[PDB]
Symmetry: D4
Subunit: 159 residues, 8 copies
Amino acid sequence: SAPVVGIIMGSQSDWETMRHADALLTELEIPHETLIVSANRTPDRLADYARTAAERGLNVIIAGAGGAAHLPGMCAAWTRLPVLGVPVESRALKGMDSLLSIVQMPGGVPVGTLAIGASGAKNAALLAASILALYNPALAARLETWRALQTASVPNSPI
Amino acid sequence: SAPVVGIIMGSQSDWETMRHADALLTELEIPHETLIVSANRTPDRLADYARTAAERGLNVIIAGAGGAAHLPGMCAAWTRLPVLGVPVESRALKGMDSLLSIVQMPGGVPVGTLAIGASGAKNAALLAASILALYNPALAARLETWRALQTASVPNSPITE
Amino acid sequence: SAPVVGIIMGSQSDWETMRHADALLTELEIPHETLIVSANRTPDRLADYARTAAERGLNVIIAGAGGAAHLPGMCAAWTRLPVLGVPVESRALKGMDSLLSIVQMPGGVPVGTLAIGASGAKNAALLAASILALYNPALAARLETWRALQTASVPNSPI
Amino acid sequence: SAPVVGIIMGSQSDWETMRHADALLTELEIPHETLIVSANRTPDRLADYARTAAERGLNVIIAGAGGAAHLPGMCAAWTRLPVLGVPVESRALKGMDSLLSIVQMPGGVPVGTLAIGASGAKNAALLAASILALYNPALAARLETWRALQTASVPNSPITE
Amino acid sequence: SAPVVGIIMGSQSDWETMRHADALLTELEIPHETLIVSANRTPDRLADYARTAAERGLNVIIAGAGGAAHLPGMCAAWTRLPVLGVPVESRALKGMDSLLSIVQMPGGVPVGTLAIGASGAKNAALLAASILALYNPALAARLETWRALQTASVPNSPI
Amino acid sequence: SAPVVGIIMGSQSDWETMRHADALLTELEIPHETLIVSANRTPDRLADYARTAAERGLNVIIAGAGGAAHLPGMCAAWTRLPVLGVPVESRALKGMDSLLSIVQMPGGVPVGTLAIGASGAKNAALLAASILALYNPALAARLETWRALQTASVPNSPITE
Amino acid sequence: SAPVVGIIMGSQSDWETMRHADALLTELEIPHETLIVSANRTPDRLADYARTAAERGLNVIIAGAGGAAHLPGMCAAWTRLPVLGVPVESRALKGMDSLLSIVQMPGGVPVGTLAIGASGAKNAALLAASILALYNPALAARLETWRALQTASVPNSPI
Amino acid sequence: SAPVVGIIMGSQSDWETMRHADALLTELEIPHETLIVSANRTPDRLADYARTAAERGLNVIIAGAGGAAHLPGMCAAWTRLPVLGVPVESRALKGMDSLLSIVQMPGGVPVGTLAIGASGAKNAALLAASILALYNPALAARLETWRALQTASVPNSPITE
């Protein structure tokens, strides 16, 4: 029941993208929390969140943000837990700024980065699931089923 | 002694970059294997490697490749294990082709991507360590100490010569 | 009657783009098959398809995909046949990721790459036609006519 | 002895890159000619070359050029034969201008484009070989052997020094 | 009455952009011709056009095209006249491919390149006008008036 | 003697670039401090530095960092003082990642960004000087003289060898 | 009452973006002027404006422009005052041309550059406010309140 | 002897590139002047230069600058004469900033832009020559001969070593 994955995003505007991560975790029945935490507007909120994540029982953190996206990297700076980053598509630069701001972390503080947008949010949840599956047999089986259904469901010819 | 992390790369030319992942895992005392698997030249070798990774005891796979870097993504297509990708810097496009070819995986098949080059290789190892630390108290303690030392080792001022 | 060109695409979403390749081949009366094969979701389907392509009588394979587009390159990895790649326009990066993921193949495993989008799908079919024309006199004549009509049909002044 | 593949390039500076296409065709025993044809300096030479390629016995044309690389596209405008383009790396833009100038052909006039640089040149030759192999059993056998050897020659592990 | 400026474009699709060049020349009463000439679809038409331009009395050629835009460069290859190029905005790459394909001409065969899109078409006409003005006093005065009105008409505060 | 400008950078490797900001402030006689503060390795050090900057007497902060350059933006998140950012050139992406990571701050938390590299560092110092000059007549006079000399020192023609 | 901040933009088309800077300054009760000044169409207007800015009592200048954006840099060339630049999003290149044309100023003539678009306009006003706050206690308090409200108003969870 | 073309550049560092424009004009016997005019450091010098260019007898202006290259555009803002711009290659961004800062002029104020670097400088001179040739028969003959020689001088095949 207690969350094992924390999904945080820079603002309400990121929800359209991050809701895909939320839906996936719920689909795989992975207990999680979904919050808004701004690296630039609520720095102390982020510090406290990242710093106490492990103590609170979180295993993986999924962070999404756009533009000069500092949320994933700064979160990783305060926690020992694996942090996965989702570059949210920005208006002007289409998420290229989001992507470079997240993926280019210097050696020492990693952020597992996923694709720009919805695909990335969905994959961050799946990646978090694959991480949890390493020590949760029941979940591992549900993930196997999920991947199996995905593969088996691809049509053979276009409509 | 059995490896829990597998480091694979597209060619010997990728070693200059991937050796940093190898070195870090060894530093943290994480058993691992290091191999060359080409997505374009040895597709069947990749299929077999990725398909059997879980049953062989591997927990995480770190794949590095450059240019049209398909190695990480295709590995993830065959394994349920988390796959971390390292974009190896390319000559002309400076790893931008490597980066986009790895990070832009479509929804459904993830690849946790790190930075272009040596930093990405080192971080792939560190990310893998943080994953394993979730269920290995001893490793978790070593990682905590490693991160703590890194933070404490940062100088307060530059050597202004 | 048996297909000599195989058109494969990563998903139904690519059809809007790849249908142009299908239409061109049909226009030139080139027997072909149109299928959905995902490099990331159906890897074994792709392996089997590419591996057996030549045995099945295929001469050229046209593969289209977007984003981290691995379909053309992986197809080429399993077949000796010429593989032509169509970068499908992606939402965020407008097919630049698709393009680099396809065209930058390392020496040893080629993929003849065409333009991003519909133009590319249409040109992959035309390129496949020009390849088949080298050993099919009837088709060669139909291709000559097609190219001739294209050239002669260009207006001299804008409307 | 008659050439079946024609390799053309915009200038002597392109040879460093295009020589890889020449070497590969020779390796596979594919008769070919190698010439310099400038789309911007010798437009009429290009027109004549492309227009008469088919009647001269050529089956495939490999064109390499950099910067505002118009050579491949204009060659394709005049010939019905398949034209493969090699983006030669440029100084400032690292071949990105070369690549876009070649690959972005509008619908109706194709240019099968390969990677920027030496890899693209080698692959243009290999692609040309795979095309010719469709109607040349002997060549098809040589190509099959070549691809098979490439796959079998990939090392299993990196020389970790 | 005889045209002194030739406006050529790769296709009808470029008209939306090139019509701005046409309108400007008409505004400044500069005799010109507006035609469709495709470098890739009508290469011989282009060769003939560029080759005979000077003989026909043309002084400047304005060429617009998008994507792998070869029209301006190839036109310049066949004529000694100044050739100005307009990169037409492409669907996927927004004219970046158009721009690089036009502006990066190697030393020896120049193409005076203008901005991507409508602004570029309008400026190619103005640049052509400034060229003709060097030897046409009447036109030079009309151009001075045009530039003067532009400057004087800029509002001092936004509405 | 009390510093009114604080120059911070992510690592010793940034000094080669940031030393230009240091040199210029000293030239204009602007008291300042120069420190290394890592946004990713010493997040708490950054929080404390930025939070207390105003009370410590600082008026402007110049922050330089490369790659995933979060230092300027995070500093601005904690201080009400104007923060100027210098994108340090990165190896692979030539500072483009540095630039976008700094300049693209969302509405509400500004970072006045300068050019990539040494020019940006020098301009960050000059911008800081122009800010301080608004309420420091003596400095305003020195800056005016500096700008005037720069303009008067530009040669009229190139040394055509 | 006399303006202490001058907001200038290249054209009426930039207003949609620069109005955000105007609104912010008004919100913080910072006296300012909002004008249209084109570096390319009204160069002498710009020269006069920038040259006399300090004499007129201005403390900071916020300049916004798109495309080949020369307004901020040229303004800085004529004034000793701090000049902040706002890259306006362009149609084709989405403000990347605007951004590079503004931020890449050579050492010697600075321009404090903000993000592309509305965010940048809003931040230029806030940056100008933070500059004025250094010597205006009342304003400094209003800025503290503004930043405090921003931080406190961020929701904890998405809707 | 009076100059009909004016070549201006932002700094001595631009000469390495702009000297190619100077050399070509001299080759074609086109009288010209070469000066350094900084758009950012000597704005008034630029205003005066551009404003008086026509009355001084100049017919074409070739302006070269890099980075935030405002020189060509601002020159065009003050003169009715055609202005040709040469994007000087920049260190970090390889002239991309130079190119966009010059070519993207808004409708109403044109700058005929050439390629990044030496090729652009040479072509700016050639473009200027083609403009002047429209009303100078002697020059038109020299240009025709120059273009003809260029075309005739292209080798037919590469020196395959």
